[PDB]
């Protein structure tokens, strides 16, 4: 429908390389951009026989991407530094929506899971970050350490969330560490003053089914003007909340209060790509594709 | 000669190795306790004809919230931070709240046990 041309997105198909970070930094475009692709159906005005070819880039960071995997299962810029909760999420992430396009390893996507939930889950269901990455433009709106401990556990849940099918039936520890980490975001939910968190919780908490009454209702009546989730600060952060936002009532099934928020952000005309671009780029258009895959 | 199932669950626990359905007489599985969390007993377990060994547990930690201290009117001696995380035989010393005074009590110094700690009180 009001599908993004494939031409503006051209510059999404990125050969990876680099290190632990910058690998993953080459990955994320051209994975979410063969994803929405895929979803709109654009390979065809676009070019077919430049789909496989943008594969093949993926499996080339895939592949990459495994020459940081540590013995542990977890992931660091380079193997001599220790593991960053952040990059090892944020790799189950990428992974999870990847297992479509390319062969991903179950091995290695649940043993980066298990990882999570045996070394960086806090005894109250916070996730903890003990190595920063060094691209801390990687990271989105999560590089504003204010409410960190929430933000960082509803990423790192979503991460969970979204490996879940493939990894449910190898990692026994992984429904009890997700409804930890939910009892820990529901209890702390309402206290949220930041709207980037409350986007990204609200989603984490609607995957679960625990965004309801007051909750639900101060996750709505955050957005400004019924169609963003802002803060002062980078418009990126607001256009990747925005898309938390828009995945968290697409999981709601609130398809009456989307279409002033894909208004918002078809006007914001954001194509992705660039310094500091990667979970603008990753999301918003995670959310536009899940807006064309449902939505009457 | 014969063969083991998938190894037993332990809580707040899980295998170090990718799970399998079938295991050979003689193979091992080692188990890893969550964070704070303390393995109690032998870590690895061993199939043999049918049963695997009997795994280890995990001892639970105590996270000191400030509601409970709010209740009690206590808060932590030495550091400000209103949450504490304690490993089990962890030693976590307490203070009165400003303006307030102990009652009879169990000593402000006290130890987390497998998930339990004896709080101590104060009033006025």
């Not at chain 1, 952040?86 to 649940?110: E, G, R």
């Not at chain 1, 980066?112 to 970050?129: M, N, R, T």
């Not at chain 1, 691209?135 to 790192?156: C, P, S, Y």
């Amino acid at each position: 429908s009001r599908s993004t041309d494939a031409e503006r997105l051209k510059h999404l198909i990125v050969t990876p390389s680099g290190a632990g970070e910058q690998n993953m930094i080459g990955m994320t475009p051209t994975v979410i951009a063969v994803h929405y692709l895929d979803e709109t159906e654009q390979w065809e005005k676009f070019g077919l026989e430049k789909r496989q070819g943008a594969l093949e880039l993926i499996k080339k960071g895939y592949t990459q991407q495994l020459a940081f995997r540590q013995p542990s299962s977890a992931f660091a810029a380079f193997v001599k530094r220790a593991p960053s909760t952040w990059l090892t999420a944020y790799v189950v992430k990428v992974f999870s929506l990847a297992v479509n396009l390319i062969a991903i390893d179950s091995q290695v996507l649940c043993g980066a899971v298990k990882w999570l939930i045996l070394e960086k889950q806090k005894p109250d269901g916070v996730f903890q970050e003990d190595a920063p990455v060094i691209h801390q433009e990687m990271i989105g709106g999560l590089r504003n350490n204010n409410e960190k401990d929430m933000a960082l556990t509803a990423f790192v849940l979503i991460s969970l969330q979204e490996a879940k099918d493939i990894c449910e039936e190898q990692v026994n520890s992984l429904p009890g560490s997700i409804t930890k980490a939910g009892d820990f975001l529901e209890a702390n939910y309402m206290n949220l003053q930041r709207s980037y968190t409350v986007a990204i919780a609200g989603y984490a908490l609607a995957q679960m089914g625990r965004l309801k009454g007051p909750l639900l209702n101060k996750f709505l009546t955050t957005a400004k003007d019924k169609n963003r989730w802002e803060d002062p600060g980078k418009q990126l952060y607001n256009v990747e909340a925005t898309s938390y936002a828009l995945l968290a009532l697409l999981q709601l099934k609130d398809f009456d209060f989307v279409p002033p928020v894909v208004r918002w952000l078809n006007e914001q005309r954001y194509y992705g790509g660039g310094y500091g671009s990667t979970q603008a780029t990753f999301m918003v258009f995670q959310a536009l594709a899940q807006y064309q895959k449902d939505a009457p | 000669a014969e063969k083991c199932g998938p190894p037993p669950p332990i809580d707040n626990g899980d295998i170090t190795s990718f799970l399998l359905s079938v295991y050979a007489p003689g193979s091992s599985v080692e188990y890893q306790c969550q964070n704070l969390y303390q393995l109690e007993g032998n870590n690895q377990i061993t199939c043999r004809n049918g049963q695997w060994s009997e795994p280890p547990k995990c001892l639970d930690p105590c996270v000191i919230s400030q509601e409970i201290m709010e209740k009690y009117n206590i808060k932590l001696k030495w550091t400000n931070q209103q949450k504490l995380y304690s490993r089990t035989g962890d030693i976590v010393e307490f203070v009165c709240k400003s303006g307030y005074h102990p009652t009879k009590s169990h000593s402000f110094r006290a130890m987390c046990q497998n998930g339990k700690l004896v709080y101590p009180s104060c009033e006025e």
